[PDB]
Design a protein around this ligand. Sequence first.
Ligand code: CLA
Ligand SMILES: CC1=C(C#C/C(C)=C/C=C/C(C)=C/C=C/C=C(C)/C=C/C=C(C)/C=C/[C@@]23O[C@]2(C)C[C@@H](O)CC3(C)C)C(C)(C)C[C@H](O)C1
Ligand SMILES: CC1=C(/C=C/C(C)=C/C=C/C(C)=C/C=C/C=C(C)/C=C/C=C(C)/C=C/C2=C(C)CCCC2(C)C)C(C)(C)CCC1
Ligand SMILES: CC1=C(C/C=C(\C)CCC[C@H](C)CCC[C@H](C)CCCC(C)C)C(=O)c2ccccc2C1=O
Lengths: 86, 221, 253, 665
Amino acid sequence: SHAVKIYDTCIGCTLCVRACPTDVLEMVPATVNAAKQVASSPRVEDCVGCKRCETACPTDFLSIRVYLQENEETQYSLGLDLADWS
Amino acid sequence: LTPAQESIAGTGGPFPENFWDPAGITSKKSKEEILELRAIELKHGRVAMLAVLGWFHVAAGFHIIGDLATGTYLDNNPLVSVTQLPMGGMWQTVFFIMCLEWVSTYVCPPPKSKPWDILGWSDILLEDEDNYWNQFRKAEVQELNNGRLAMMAIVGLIVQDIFFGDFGEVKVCFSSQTCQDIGDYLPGWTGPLPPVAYDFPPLYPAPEVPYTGYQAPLKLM
Amino acid sequence: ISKIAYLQDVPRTILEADVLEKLLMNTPRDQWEDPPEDTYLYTLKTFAEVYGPGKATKMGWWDYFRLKLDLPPGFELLDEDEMKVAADYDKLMMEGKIPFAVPGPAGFWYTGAVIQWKGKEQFAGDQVQTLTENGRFSKQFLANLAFYRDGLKPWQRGLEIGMAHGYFLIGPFTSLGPLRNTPEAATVGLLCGCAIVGLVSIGGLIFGSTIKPTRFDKEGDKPASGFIEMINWHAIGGLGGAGFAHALITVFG
Amino acid sequence: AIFRYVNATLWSKAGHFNKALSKGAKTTTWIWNLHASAHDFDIQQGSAGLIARKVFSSGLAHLSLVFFWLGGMHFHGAYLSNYSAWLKDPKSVAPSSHIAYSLVGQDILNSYTSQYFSGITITSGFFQLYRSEGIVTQSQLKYACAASLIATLICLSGSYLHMQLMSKFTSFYKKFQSLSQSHLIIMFGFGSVSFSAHQIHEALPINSLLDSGIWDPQLFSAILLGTPSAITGKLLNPSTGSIFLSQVAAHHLAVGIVFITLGLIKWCNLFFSRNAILSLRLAYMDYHAQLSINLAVWASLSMVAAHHLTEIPVYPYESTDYPTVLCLFVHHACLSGFFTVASGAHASIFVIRQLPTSEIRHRDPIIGHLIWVCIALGLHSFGLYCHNDTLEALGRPEDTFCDNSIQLKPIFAKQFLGLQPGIEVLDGKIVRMTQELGTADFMVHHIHAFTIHVTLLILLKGVLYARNSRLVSDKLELGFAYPCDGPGRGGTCQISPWDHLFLAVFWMYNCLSVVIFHYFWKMQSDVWGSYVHHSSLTCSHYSQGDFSVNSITINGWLRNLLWSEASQVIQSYALPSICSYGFIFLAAHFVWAFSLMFLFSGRAYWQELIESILWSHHKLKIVPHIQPRALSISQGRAVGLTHYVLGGIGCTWAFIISRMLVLTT
Ligand code: CLA
Ligand SMILES: CC1=C(C#C/C(C)=C/C=C/C(C)=C/C=C/C=C(C)/C=C/C=C(C)/C=C/[C@@]23O[C@]2(C)C[C@@H](O)CC3(C)C)C(C)(C)C[C@H](O)C1
Ligand SMILES: CC1=C(/C=C/C(C)=C/C=C/C(C)=C/C=C/C=C(C)/C=C/C=C(C)/C=C/C2=C(C)CCCC2(C)C)C(C)(C)CCC1
Ligand SMILES: CC1=C(C/C=C(\C)CCC[C@H](C)CCC[C@H](C)CCCC(C)C)C(=O)c2ccccc2C1=O
């Protein structure tokens, strides 16, 4: 699976969460920024690696980073449809 | 009609709704017998349609398997071509049709309710669908009428060939037959214009002595 | 309808009564109140609110010309039968039934049949019905193949399949091989066919050793034992069929 | 109707049409997007009425452009051409309405065409077209040019006017029944009848006089006079080597009558199977659906034109004008391919913007079987060539697929003309000769089928999987032209219908290049050439009939066609006639190679290089406020594709034209 990390530069605009195609991310309460919320990545097992969160991130450099891990590819991260590894 | 006869009603006669039976063969038959009669009729009709197709195809020439097998051009008359064909090909054809019949009658037998349903359409087909796009009765009646016409046609072709040596020669005029002339292409034609025996006279008389700036009407000649 | 102001007593010049009826029938009922901007009904509403009895009774020649240009004629709108046919088509497709058609030359013909496109599992794309695979004839044929036939031991399945495979495999090498013109063409083709049978049987043994299918296995038996038995007997049957074909060729020229 | 709203104020805004370009010129990507979306009237600010306005007015403006081009052609023929010398003696003088300057020694390009004329030999067949039309005077050509210019002005005025005449209520463009009926009865039926009238009344007397040898002004200013009862096409004009123009006029009269009859039966509703097409009628009332259908129709008609313009001779002396016939075939084949890929593109756009037809719901079997047929066709067809190569190299010709060895006879390729035995000749050239089909023709035709099927596979996959797929389920949300969906799910590069076209264009170009090479080599080897003396002639062909012996191997194609026949273009530098063709050969090679840059590289390398370069500009205080950017991914693909196709087409163009020009002169 890929690694989706969030950094404190986050401003809690929720655009990453809204752009998530498989609902990997969710906003959580925080005090670091004025919006009082920061995106989290609890369901990183479903991350496919499309980097749409990264596309939608406003900050100067991304407060959300998706690191691709081709060696640890799973069926959920590969979006397998015709074949099942479960 | 009768309860047994109704099993096929709507798929016969000139109009589909008729029941042509001057002999009254099906008057006393049971539903199973009527279904078997329809199966025989449809098998004969389909075989006759294919037979007419192949008969015309071989009568136009176009008999390549035979040509290559015999190393020579086989006679266009299909009945002569049968005898010209090698016994090898003849027995191969008989064996292939025998295998088809065996598979269709023992390995994949049609249902007892629809003995003519060779391809098993009555497992995904919905004949009793009240949609407009449900002209399966039209398709069935077209099949039956074409098959009956083909049965009569093939029997007539064979009888005429046996009697007067006439096999209903086809004048396809493109590949096996090299038609050199317009008369060959269209009977009775000898020129660009149609062969009408009427000389179209002028609707109005012309001036015997012309004048400057006349521009007399052109002639198609 | 009477409740619509602009549809009341529309002058014949602006739009004929029959064409107006056809346009209303074609248009959805809910759109009569306030049709979308790009519709004939919207144009008719806009111009009937301005022209007609109790309003401007004259128009410039060019304005009237443009109005007649951009209003619909009778033959442009669908007929009752056409609308019924389209509605039936859409209803069939949404219900999961397909008015059967086969592609032809740069098109497709309608065979006049309605089939059940959706299978038992509605959301399963594997189960969509087709005559090729889901017809009675196809079901019976596939079920009666040696791989599937009921009451067959794995050795029987493999033997029959191999007989067929070797018997047809010897021929290509015999007829089109490098030594096809030599007196040993048939024997060399038999050797090549036996080699092909052996290679495919080795591949099948690899398949049964790696994936280990267990559909042919007896109860309380090692996994893939039935499959391996079937593959070994396929090798045997391929040898036998290749030999039989070679013998027939040799004996009957 | 209100023309007070057309002002030049918007001319300087440069992006008003697209709302996404409101933040003008923050980067060079803005410039590129402006150009890319200039003519995408659907996504531009406005309404559906405005979209229709723009579509129709742009069509009229392009009509005016084409009329201007035709008028320029007529003017060049009238004033800058040797049409007089060609008309009096077509064989000796090559057509040339093209003259070059003497700027830098560029006068070398002009070549000897006549005693008093030097220029560039044209290959468009315009001289033959004029001769068929009966244009034999500079005054006639001048008035044709004047008519073309007047038509250009009229079309320009029509576009400008219709930009405002059509309002939001305008609906005449949605009257498909009226449109089709008018086009079928007037544009086609009446048009064909009127052109038959023109031929009968003007071209037939002039052409008959020209064939006889009469050049008298009074005569230049009795149908079927010379045509025998022989079927049309079975007897060519002995003095011109083309179908009788009276037969052509009768053809046009018959075609016009048939079109009028079809229109009238449609008017009377005689056609009955409306329901079979009602689904398409409801679905495909869209700009892009109609554009795709029309593009495919015109592509197929262009291919048929390419074949018929050569196989069936109808223009005077075009049969013996070998460069003309070759160039016409190649040009129309290329247009066929381009318009077919265009039809695929706009089918994909229609699927994206509108609801698709129900054949998309079993798309997996369709594309799966197309994939299988493509694989099997390619394997067999190309592996026959590879087998021939390997066996011939090993030294076993008896094992190869050829007429002498194992032979694949095209049994189905049967005659239909029923021509008489022999060939037709005209002044030391073979105007018409039967093409004899064998193993080489079988193999090349199956190669053609393979390439056509693979191009169709790419286009159909793009069309059917445009809305969604197993990989990505929101491709509809992504749109039509996007680079990818991300590196995820393994990588979603080029999943868009735009990229499917970007690949189908490569495959169409490959198919058309093979078709061009086949036509060129087959015609040179087995059809074209001269003859040496009931009389029997030994025919000396330009390629010496080597197609049937050498075309069976890829090495034969490489040696006897490319290397052997590139002698003219490769050795064209000193020759005044074709030095330009040699230089264009070289430059097209350069451009094709340069395209690989964009086809292989990626955006990020160039963006980083641009930033490193911009460091120095910032250091020296050269700050471009339209910040430089690397070309987008889709733009890089488009640029690479354009340069690739242009370079390949230029190489083929120069090679074939140089060969033909040198051989015929
Ligand atoms: C294999 C032949 C065959 C068979 C089994 C059937 C069977 C049937 N037809 Mg018939 N039919 C046939 C051929 C056949 N048809 C042909 C060729 C035609 C065209 C004339 C028709 C036209 C026709 C119509 C219009 C209708 C039927 C209908 C029927 C059904 C009820 C009537 C009946 O009892 O028919 C039984 C038929 C027979 C037992 C055939 C007897 C043939 C006799 C013995 C004469 C054969 C001689 C022939 C001319 C060949 C001579 C060759 C020689 C000179 C060398 C029944 C299922 C009705 C139906 O489906 O209603 C719903 C109906 O309306 N058929
Ligand atoms: C229905 C009805 C009635 C009736 C009736 C009638 C008139 C019935 C008639 C039935 C009829 C006439 C049925 C023909 C079948 C023909 C077949 C199967 C042909 C096969 C043809 C074949 C297999 C052809 C083969 C080949 O040609 C091929 C393809 C190419 C050639 O190279 C080689 C050969 C020659 C080998 C009555 C009597 C009034 C009573 C009742 O009241 C109502
Ligand atoms: C679709 C189609 C088709 C197809 C076909 C096919 C596909 C076939 C197949 C065929 C085949 C594929 C066959 C085979 C056969 C086989 C055989 C017949 C075998 C036999 C064998 C044997 C007999 C053996 C024996 C043995 C053994 C086993 C071992 C020991 C030794 C011995 C020798 C004893 C056709 C063409 C018709 C056409 C139409 C369509
Ligand atoms: C080279 C390259 C670049 C860099 C190329 C750029 C920025 C193009 C430069 C544009 C110039 C400024 C346009 C002006 C036109 C030429 C300078 C004209 C030269 C004409 C000669 C005859 C002199 C990309 O950005 C790129 C992006 C994605 C895939 C591949 C590539 C790619 O291959």
